[PDB]
Amino acid sequence: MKNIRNFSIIAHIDHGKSTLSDRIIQICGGLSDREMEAQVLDSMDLERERGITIKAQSVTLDYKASDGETYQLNFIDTPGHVDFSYEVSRSLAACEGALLVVDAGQGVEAQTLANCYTAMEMDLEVVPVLNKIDLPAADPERVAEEIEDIVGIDATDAVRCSAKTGVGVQDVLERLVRDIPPPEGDPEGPLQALIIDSWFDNYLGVVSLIRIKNGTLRKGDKVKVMSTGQTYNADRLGIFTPKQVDRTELKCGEVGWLVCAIKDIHGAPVGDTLTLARNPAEKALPGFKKVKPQVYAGLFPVSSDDYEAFRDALGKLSLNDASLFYEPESSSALGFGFRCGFLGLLHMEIIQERLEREYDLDLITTAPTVVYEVETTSREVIYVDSPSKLPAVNNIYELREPIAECHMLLPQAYLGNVITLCVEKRGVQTNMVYHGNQVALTYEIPMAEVVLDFFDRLKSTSRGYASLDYNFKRFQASDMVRVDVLINGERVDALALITHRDNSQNRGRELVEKMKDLIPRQQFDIAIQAAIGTHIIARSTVKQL
Amino acid sequence: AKKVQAYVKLQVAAGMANPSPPVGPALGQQGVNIMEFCKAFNAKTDSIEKGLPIPVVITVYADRSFTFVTKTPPAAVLLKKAAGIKSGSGKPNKDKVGKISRAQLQEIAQTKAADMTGADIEAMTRSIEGTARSMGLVVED
Amino acid sequence: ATVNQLVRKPRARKVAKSNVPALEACPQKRGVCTRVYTTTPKKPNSALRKVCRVRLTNGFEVTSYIGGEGHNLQEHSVILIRGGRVKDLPGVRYHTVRGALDCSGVKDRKQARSKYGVKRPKA
RNA sequence: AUGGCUGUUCGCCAU
RNA sequence: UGUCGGGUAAGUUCCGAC
RNA sequence: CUGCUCCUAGUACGAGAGGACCGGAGUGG
RNA sequence: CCCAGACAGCCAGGAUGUUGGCUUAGAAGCAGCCAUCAUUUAAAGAAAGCGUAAUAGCUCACUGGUCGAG
RNA sequence: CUCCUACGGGAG
RNA sequence: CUACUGGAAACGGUAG
RNA sequence: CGCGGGGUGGAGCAGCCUGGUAGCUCGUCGGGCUCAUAACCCGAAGGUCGUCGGUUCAAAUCCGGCCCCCGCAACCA
RNA sequence: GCGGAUUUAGCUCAGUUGGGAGAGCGCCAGACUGAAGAUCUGGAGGUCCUGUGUUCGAUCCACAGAAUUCGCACCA
């Protein structure tokens, strides 16, 4: 245990953290050849295409230090976003420290900051690393000041290194061992193993990556997954090198893989803890959950024949996505699809990109929105999931849309681009507090609008320095208006829209013109009209030939 | 007589302070101790005068500490109460919402005399008249 | 009849029609729920009962009833077809087993809990 | 710009 | 060049319908 | 007459997604 | 219009009632409507444009002096 | 079909 | 078995 | 663009060149028959006559001005 | 774009004395039925398209504007 060092790498760019990640492997295990980002360095297809880690594997290495001793380095790759805020914290919860790989030519950035802040909020040693010093545009001394200024971390003795040569990467490892404390626990205490990840191996079956917090796991041992309460036999276990080597036992403070014949990956959930059956730990390790989503959107196949594949693809994603929510939904116009919940914008964008490429699905995706509280003319309260079930306009006394309280953190320079979005999305400012050159904004925004991708638009307009947290607050009167169209008399639902009052008249006129372009002068007069309730707001009639 | 210095200025209610929107973040950015000021201000403000918004100049030091000098107040409002009305005219001079005797004008001029630059009582009264004309309040002399 | 009259064409059994097509020996099949509604009874009765058109695993889309008071049955909500027809509901030759898969059992039903779906009151 | 249709120019459609 | 169906990558002609 | 590809440079720009200038090489209709 | 100092240049200032009333989430000279006075003066528009969420802030009108004939 | 490959050819 | 020799391999070929 | 026919109680048709009298069928309303509904029977009501004006003692009626309604022609190059 | 017509309750629409905001459908209820329906009663139901103006008073009058619609012009 005294010789184990668990840590994760917070980096951007690439910054040379994941290529620091890569270079570390080269100077240790190897195993052989150091890979390149251009090469499929990260294993999954998603990572390959983007050329980013979405999430990597994690690696266990052995490093002989200058003191002549061998250190088991177990490191986890940290995905760099707050949509997976929970997942990130759980990886960091498995560490005693972290590396902050910063480009000497660029300087720090806000997606490497929130993970870095939470890393300090949990008592982890954060080692500053100045990367890519060989580049002509590298300014180490200045970037050192930036880390000390923005992050609040001491970087006077910050270790620096090259991506060209690999010089000083060993010194990064020397520092690591010196300053990150060894993992803690009782090798004899009741077994407590944190499930970091579980996947399916087409030959080995369900495999879990483990961190041992307490006790010792050996080959024969009958293990217990604490949530399910079921028991299993630890048939095989070992470490990654990254090569898969078996071991007789995983001891306290070590990271490795376990193969016991668990049915599916839900039988070994991420965050759960493994104890021994003969000697079960009294209390499961902290922070286990399922977890939940902010943002919602409907996804419908272009072709109804894709529906089968789409349903199965959601199921496939669901075995490994704990916070992905989906539920069946149908439209007259759009067809059979699924109403979907997401943690935020890039959670939605990852899944969409994955649905598009891996599962090869051409999909229609409606703009995101939320549920409502309706009071009938015959006074009473009903709740509407699906817009197709909303009472007739005449029967609505008051339509009440959910308001979300959005707590946002952002640097002062950006609030101009931020509150302009807020009010574009119908927000009302509730409070504003100053903290140095950082502003704490609290806004009340309609949930229907928070869910229809706005999270991305805030993250773009502030270049990822604004951090959103929203919860339900109230129902209120909506103040957005529903404009039908009926063409030749007949209701065309597919053509209906929800738009803000102030230009609902205007949006109605545009909808009629759009139609007039798609419908030529034909055999019979064709009347196209937009309407709110009983009231016609725009009518145009395509004269017959 | 001296020279400008690092400090923030703001007009806060008599006996009440500490809210984020009004104060807090305002001087909080400078590194001011909101908790100390709110209690310190209202402390002497109660004795000085309550119910009247008083502008104070908070002077912060390198020790992020601070001091403040308390001062004085406004007009349209005095004519509204004197006239017995709640709001202005909306269309001044066009339609009169209320009226004020020249006697009251003088009174209000006496109250604001502290903030007014008028050399004499007649002058300050003339100034008060300008406020009335802008709020649709005629004066009966 | 006459012995010889039979030797030509012996008596034969009248193949009974399985009043349960979406059966295939299967005592029950999963579903998909094409949609759920609230229809009306036959003629002697009234009140709008609850029915649903669920699509079976074998593509034998059919309609079922929703016994018990209330139900969370949404749309894409999958269910397990039971069988058994109804009277007031024409065609409906199947019923949805409550307290299984996605459909939840009755609420506060302290009697004949085996049906619908309610695992013990509170002991 | 080649084709489907049309005598068509044109136009609609496919690429 | 009515509308729908067929044929074609695409059919003011053609075949089947209303 | 002009497409495209490689380099510059995944650089400037960008919260991302995405993504040049200027200049250089090659291969096509 | 000006040697009772012109125009350009130049330096100085440009305040108080008041953030005018209404309106508005906010409208403080500067979204919009109405009013557009009084006080202090060498001068000082409830204000000409930019700007802020609103303030702030910057420049402008105005006037004083330097120069000296257009 | 599935897998290996040094693309010649192999394996179940 | 030995001595040679073809292939990435599977798998061979010469001579004694 | 031009010819010529027509706007009358709720619907469908008369009455107009021969200016003062608005006629018919259907339906609306009330009362009967019938257990009741139809049917059948008796008894009523209801029209700025398309509009803006002109001639006359008087205009559905005669003369012009448009507004919808219907038909017939609109040919040679 | 130029002109006319139109814009009143959820739908379809009356509304001419400048002062009452209406009908039918619709929906709910009461009466009636053995019930439902049909009829009669009643109730809930309004941004009289918006703004400004005229007026003691505006659905109504005036101006500006908006929207719908018709009239002025390529089978595919």
mmCIF file of N, CA and C in Angstrom, chain A residues 222-293:
data_model
loop_
_atom_site.group_PDB
_atom_site.id
_atom_site.type_symbol
_atom_site.label_atom_id
_atom_site.label_comp_id
_atom_site.label_asym_id
_atom_site.label_seq_id
_atom_site.Cartn_x
_atom_site.Cartn_y
_atom_site.Cartn_z
ATOM 1 N N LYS A 222 -15.466 -15.825 -2.463
ATOM 2 C CA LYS A 222 -16.832 -15.570 -2.941
ATOM 3 C C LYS A 222 -17.269 -14.139 -2.625
ATOM 4 N N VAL A 223 -17.404 -13.347 -3.683
ATOM 5 C CA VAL A 223 -17.659 -11.919 -3.563
ATOM 6 C C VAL A 223 -19.146 -11.591 -3.476
ATOM 7 N N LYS A 224 -19.435 -10.389 -2.988
ATOM 8 C CA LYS A 224 -20.795 -9.917 -2.804
ATOM 9 C C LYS A 224 -20.907 -8.501 -3.351
ATOM 10 N N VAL A 225 -21.827 -8.315 -4.290
ATOM 11 C CA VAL A 225 -22.136 -6.989 -4.787
ATOM 12 C C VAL A 225 -23.171 -6.435 -3.833
ATOM 13 N N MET A 226 -22.831 -5.326 -3.185
ATOM 14 C CA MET A 226 -23.595 -4.836 -2.039
ATOM 15 C C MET A 226 -25.010 -4.332 -2.342
ATOM 16 N N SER A 227 -25.221 -3.777 -3.534
ATOM 17 C CA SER A 227 -26.551 -3.316 -3.940
ATOM 18 C C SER A 227 -27.486 -4.482 -4.208
ATOM 19 N N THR A 228 -27.127 -5.311 -5.184
ATOM 20 C CA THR A 228 -27.930 -6.481 -5.531
ATOM 21 C C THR A 228 -27.976 -7.488 -4.375
ATOM 22 N N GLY A 229 -26.894 -7.559 -3.605
ATOM 23 C CA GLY A 229 -26.808 -8.473 -2.472
ATOM 24 C C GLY A 229 -26.462 -9.883 -2.899
ATOM 25 N N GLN A 230 -26.344 -10.095 -4.213
ATOM 26 C CA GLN A 230 -25.982 -11.400 -4.762
ATOM 27 C C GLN A 230 -24.497 -11.719 -4.591
ATOM 28 N N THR A 231 -24.176 -13.012 -4.584
ATOM 29 C CA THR A 231 -22.795 -13.472 -4.444
ATOM 30 C C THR A 231 -22.270 -14.109 -5.727
ATOM 31 N N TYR A 232 -20.955 -14.039 -5.914
ATOM 32 C CA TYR A 232 -20.292 -14.592 -7.091
ATOM 33 C C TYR A 232 -18.920 -15.159 -6.720
ATOM 34 N N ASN A 233 -18.375 -16.032 -7.565
ATOM 35 C CA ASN A 233 -17.021 -16.558 -7.361
ATOM 36 C C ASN A 233 -15.960 -15.841 -8.187
ATOM 37 N N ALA A 234 -14.937 -15.323 -7.507
ATOM 38 C CA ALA A 234 -13.839 -14.608 -8.161
ATOM 39 C C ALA A 234 -12.923 -15.541 -8.963
ATOM 40 N N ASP A 235 -13.390 -15.985 -10.127
ATOM 41 C CA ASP A 235 -12.665 -16.987 -10.915
ATOM 42 C C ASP A 235 -11.299 -16.489 -11.365
ATOM 43 N N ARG A 236 -11.272 -15.298 -11.957
ATOM 44 C CA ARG A 236 -10.027 -14.709 -12.450
ATOM 45 C C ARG A 236 -9.928 -13.239 -12.092
ATOM 46 N N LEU A 237 -8.704 -12.789 -11.844
ATOM 47 C CA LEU A 237 -8.426 -11.374 -11.618
ATOM 48 C C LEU A 237 -6.977 -11.037 -11.944
ATOM 49 N N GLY A 238 -6.723 -9.759 -12.199
ATOM 50 C CA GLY A 238 -5.371 -9.284 -12.439
ATOM 51 C C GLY A 238 -5.300 -7.794 -12.681
ATOM 52 N N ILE A 239 -4.248 -7.374 -13.374
ATOM 53 C CA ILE A 239 -4.017 -5.966 -13.676
ATOM 54 C C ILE A 239 -3.877 -5.747 -15.183
ATOM 55 N N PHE A 240 -3.953 -4.488 -15.604
ATOM 56 C CA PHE A 240 -3.604 -4.110 -16.970
ATOM 57 C C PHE A 240 -2.213 -3.467 -16.990
ATOM 58 N N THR A 241 -1.507 -3.622 -18.105
ATOM 59 C CA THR A 241 -0.077 -3.316 -18.162
ATOM 60 C C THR A 241 0.395 -2.337 -19.269
ATOM 61 N N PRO A 242 -0.466 -1.996 -20.259
ATOM 62 C CA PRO A 242 -1.899 -2.247 -20.476
ATOM 63 C C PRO A 242 -2.272 -3.687 -20.850
ATOM 64 N N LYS A 243 -1.272 -4.534 -21.125
ATOM 65 C CA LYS A 243 -1.501 -5.966 -21.366
ATOM 66 C C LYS A 243 -2.192 -6.615 -20.174
ATOM 67 N N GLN A 244 -3.087 -7.556 -20.453
ATOM 68 C CA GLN A 244 -3.864 -8.212 -19.410
ATOM 69 C C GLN A 244 -3.088 -9.364 -18.767
ATOM 70 N N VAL A 245 -2.598 -9.120 -17.559
ATOM 71 C CA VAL A 245 -1.871 -10.115 -16.789
ATOM 72 C C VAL A 245 -2.735 -10.560 -15.609
ATOM 73 N N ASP A 246 -2.840 -11.874 -15.417
ATOM 74 C CA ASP A 246 -3.560 -12.430 -14.273
ATOM 75 C C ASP A 246 -2.720 -12.305 -13.011
ATOM 76 N N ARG A 247 -3.390 -12.299 -11.865
ATOM 77 C CA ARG A 247 -2.724 -12.297 -10.567
ATOM 78 C C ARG A 247 -3.431 -13.276 -9.648
ATOM 79 N N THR A 248 -2.727 -13.718 -8.611
ATOM 80 C CA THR A 248 -3.326 -14.555 -7.575
ATOM 81 C C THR A 248 -4.296 -13.756 -6.691
ATOM 82 N N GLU A 249 -3.979 -12.483 -6.462
ATOM 83 C CA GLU A 249 -4.753 -11.637 -5.557
ATOM 84 C C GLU A 249 -4.622 -10.146 -5.872
ATOM 85 N N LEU A 250 -5.680 -9.393 -5.590
ATOM 86 C CA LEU A 250 -5.610 -7.937 -5.568
ATOM 87 C C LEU A 250 -5.619 -7.453 -4.123
ATOM 88 N N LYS A 251 -4.553 -6.764 -3.724
ATOM 89 C CA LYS A 251 -4.399 -6.317 -2.332
ATOM 90 C C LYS A 251 -4.771 -4.846 -2.132
ATOM 91 N N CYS A 252 -4.786 -4.415 -0.870
ATOM 92 C CA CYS A 252 -5.298 -3.099 -0.493
ATOM 93 C C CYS A 252 -4.520 -1.956 -1.134
ATOM 94 N N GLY A 253 -5.240 -1.100 -1.857
ATOM 95 C CA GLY A 253 -4.653 0.056 -2.528
ATOM 96 C C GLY A 253 -4.405 -0.168 -4.010
ATOM 97 N N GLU A 254 -4.685 -1.378 -4.487
ATOM 98 C CA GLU A 254 -4.411 -1.729 -5.873
ATOM 99 C C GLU A 254 -5.627 -1.597 -6.788
ATOM 100 N N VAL A 255 -5.339 -1.386 -8.070
ATOM 101 C CA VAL A 255 -6.353 -1.282 -9.112
ATOM 102 C C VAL A 255 -6.178 -2.435 -10.092
ATOM 103 N N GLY A 256 -7.285 -3.102 -10.421
ATOM 104 C CA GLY A 256 -7.251 -4.248 -11.327
ATOM 105 C C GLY A 256 -8.611 -4.702 -11.814
ATOM 106 N N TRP A 257 -8.626 -5.812 -12.543
ATOM 107 C CA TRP A 257 -9.857 -6.316 -13.149
ATOM 108 C C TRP A 257 -10.296 -7.608 -12.476
ATOM 109 N N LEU A 258 -11.607 -7.834 -12.442
ATOM 110 C CA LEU A 258 -12.169 -9.036 -11.842
ATOM 111 C C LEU A 258 -13.159 -9.712 -12.768
ATOM 112 N N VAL A 259 -12.981 -11.013 -12.976
ATOM 113 C CA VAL A 259 -13.925 -11.809 -13.753
ATOM 114 C C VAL A 259 -14.579 -12.906 -12.902
ATOM 115 N N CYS A 260 -15.781 -12.604 -12.429
ATOM 116 C CA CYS A 260 -16.689 -13.596 -11.868
ATOM 117 C C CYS A 260 -17.932 -13.577 -12.750
ATOM 118 N N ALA A 261 -18.546 -14.740 -12.948
ATOM 119 C CA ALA A 261 -19.569 -14.925 -13.984
ATOM 120 C C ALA A 261 -20.892 -14.207 -13.703
ATOM 121 N N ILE A 262 -20.814 -12.882 -13.610
ATOM 122 C CA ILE A 262 -21.978 -12.016 -13.461
ATOM 123 C C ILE A 262 -22.757 -11.977 -14.778
ATOM 124 N N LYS A 263 -24.082 -12.082 -14.668
ATOM 125 C CA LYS A 263 -24.995 -12.147 -15.815
ATOM 126 C C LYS A 263 -24.754 -11.028 -16.842
ATOM 127 N N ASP A 264 -25.121 -9.803 -16.476
ATOM 128 C CA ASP A 264 -24.909 -8.626 -17.319
ATOM 129 C C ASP A 264 -24.286 -7.505 -16.494
ATOM 130 N N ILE A 265 -23.902 -6.416 -17.155
ATOM 131 C CA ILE A 265 -23.171 -5.333 -16.493
ATOM 132 C C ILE A 265 -23.998 -4.522 -15.494
ATOM 133 N N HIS A 266 -25.300 -4.796 -15.432
ATOM 134 C CA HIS A 266 -26.169 -4.217 -14.405
ATOM 135 C C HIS A 266 -26.026 -4.953 -13.083
ATOM 136 N N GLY A 267 -25.482 -6.168 -13.145
ATOM 137 C CA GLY A 267 -25.236 -6.986 -11.959
ATOM 138 C C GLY A 267 -24.023 -6.520 -11.183
ATOM 139 N N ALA A 268 -23.181 -5.725 -11.837
ATOM 140 C CA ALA A 268 -22.039 -5.078 -11.194
ATOM 141 C C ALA A 268 -22.066 -3.593 -11.542
ATOM 142 N N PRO A 269 -22.946 -2.820 -10.872
ATOM 143 C CA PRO A 269 -23.167 -1.432 -11.255
ATOM 144 C C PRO A 269 -21.968 -0.569 -10.905
ATOM 145 N N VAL A 270 -21.744 0.476 -11.699
ATOM 146 C CA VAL A 270 -20.668 1.426 -11.445
ATOM 147 C C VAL A 270 -20.968 2.202 -10.159
ATOM 148 N N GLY A 271 -19.995 2.220 -9.250
ATOM 149 C CA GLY A 271 -20.127 2.914 -7.966
ATOM 150 C C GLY A 271 -20.396 1.994 -6.792
ATOM 151 N N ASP A 272 -20.875 0.787 -7.096
ATOM 152 C CA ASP A 272 -21.190 -0.230 -6.092
ATOM 153 C C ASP A 272 -19.904 -0.705 -5.427
ATOM 154 N N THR A 273 -20.020 -1.464 -4.338
ATOM 155 C CA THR A 273 -18.828 -1.949 -3.640
ATOM 156 C C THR A 273 -18.849 -3.461 -3.466
ATOM 157 N N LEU A 274 -17.680 -4.081 -3.608
ATOM 158 C CA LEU A 274 -17.547 -5.522 -3.426
ATOM 159 C C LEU A 274 -16.980 -5.864 -2.062
ATOM 160 N N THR A 275 -17.720 -6.688 -1.330
ATOM 161 C CA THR A 275 -17.244 -7.219 -0.066
ATOM 162 C C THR A 275 -17.214 -8.746 -0.131
ATOM 163 N N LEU A 276 -16.568 -9.377 0.845
ATOM 164 C CA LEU A 276 -16.548 -10.834 0.926
ATOM 165 C C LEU A 276 -17.804 -11.354 1.609
ATOM 166 N N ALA A 277 -18.266 -12.526 1.179
ATOM 167 C CA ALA A 277 -19.499 -13.114 1.699
ATOM 168 C C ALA A 277 -19.358 -13.576 3.147
ATOM 169 N N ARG A 278 -18.226 -14.203 3.459
ATOM 170 C CA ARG A 278 -17.960 -14.726 4.804
ATOM 171 C C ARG A 278 -17.717 -13.601 5.813
ATOM 172 N N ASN A 279 -17.278 -12.449 5.308
ATOM 173 C CA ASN A 279 -16.958 -11.293 6.134
ATOM 174 C C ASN A 279 -17.395 -9.981 5.462
ATOM 175 N N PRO A 280 -18.725 -9.733 5.400
ATOM 176 C CA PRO A 280 -19.226 -8.557 4.690
ATOM 177 C C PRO A 280 -18.979 -7.251 5.438
ATOM 178 N N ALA A 281 -18.516 -6.236 4.706
ATOM 179 C CA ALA A 281 -18.360 -4.886 5.240
ATOM 180 C C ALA A 281 -19.713 -4.355 5.696
ATOM 181 N N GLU A 282 -19.719 -3.695 6.849
ATOM 182 C CA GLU A 282 -20.959 -3.248 7.476
ATOM 183 C C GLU A 282 -21.665 -2.191 6.634
ATOM 184 N N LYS A 283 -20.885 -1.237 6.136
ATOM 185 C CA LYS A 283 -21.409 -0.102 5.389
ATOM 186 C C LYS A 283 -20.747 -0.045 4.013
ATOM 187 N N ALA A 284 -21.560 0.056 2.961
ATOM 188 C CA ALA A 284 -21.043 0.187 1.601
ATOM 189 C C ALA A 284 -20.348 1.534 1.434
ATOM 190 N N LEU A 285 -19.306 1.563 0.607
ATOM 191 C CA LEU A 285 -18.569 2.793 0.292
ATOM 192 C C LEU A 285 -19.485 3.933 -0.156
ATOM 193 N N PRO A 286 -19.127 5.184 0.196
ATOM 194 C CA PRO A 286 -20.037 6.304 -0.015
ATOM 195 C C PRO A 286 -20.177 6.709 -1.483
ATOM 196 N N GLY A 287 -21.319 7.297 -1.825
ATOM 197 C CA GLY A 287 -21.499 7.933 -3.127
ATOM 198 C C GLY A 287 -22.057 7.075 -4.248
ATOM 199 N N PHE A 288 -22.524 5.876 -3.917
ATOM 200 C CA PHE A 288 -23.194 5.028 -4.896
ATOM 201 C C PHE A 288 -24.576 5.584 -5.219
ATOM 202 N N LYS A 289 -24.939 5.525 -6.498
ATOM 203 C CA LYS A 289 -26.298 5.827 -6.935
ATOM 204 C C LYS A 289 -26.527 5.256 -8.318
ATOM 205 N N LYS A 290 -27.822 5.378 -8.690
ATOM 206 C CA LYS A 290 -28.141 5.432 -10.086
ATOM 207 C C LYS A 290 -27.865 6.785 -10.776
ATOM 208 N N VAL A 291 -28.414 7.975 -10.386
ATOM 209 C CA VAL A 291 -28.282 9.239 -11.183
ATOM 210 C C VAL A 291 -29.136 9.428 -12.492
ATOM 211 N N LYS A 292 -29.486 10.750 -12.838
ATOM 212 C CA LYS A 292 -30.604 11.489 -13.494
ATOM 213 C C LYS A 292 -30.226 12.727 -14.401
ATOM 214 N N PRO A 293 -31.179 13.193 -15.111
ATOM 215 C CA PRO A 293 -30.819 14.044 -16.216
ATOM 216 C C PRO A 293 -31.443 15.378 -16.140
#
